[PDB]
Amino acid sequence: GVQVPDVRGQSSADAIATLQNRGFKIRTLQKPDSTIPPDHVIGTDPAANTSVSAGDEITVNVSTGPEQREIPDVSTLTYAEAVKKLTAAGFGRFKQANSPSTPELVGKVIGTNPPANQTSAITNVVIIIVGSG
Q1: 1-65: which CATH number, 3.30.460.80, 3.30.10.20, 3.20.20.10, 2.40.30.10?
Q2: Strand locations in 7-104, DSSP E?
């Protein structure tokens, strides 16, 4: 068998060249990772140092950086509802802000920071802006 080289950390291009030089076929998967930078390799399947048949396909897990999610719209909800919905989307760190609104939005969410539909790391604090006035 041919040993799968350990390409964790290598750029996707460099890792793929290394694997190709050993005769492997390649498929890539793009996955979040908290410690390998974007476009660098997390690991392979089959894993580094495994012995496999010459020419076998190796799956190369390529980092897209830390996990990110799209911020859901939570406008006109209560703060409590907004926290539940943001939590369901993967976020967990929240702060409240006040900003002037029309009477019927007073006490309701008028937006977030980062704003709705923006992609954000799930480690980021999401400010939930509530109408005041």
Answers
A1: 3.30.10.20
A2: 25-31, 41-45, 51-52, 57-63, 68-70, 94-100
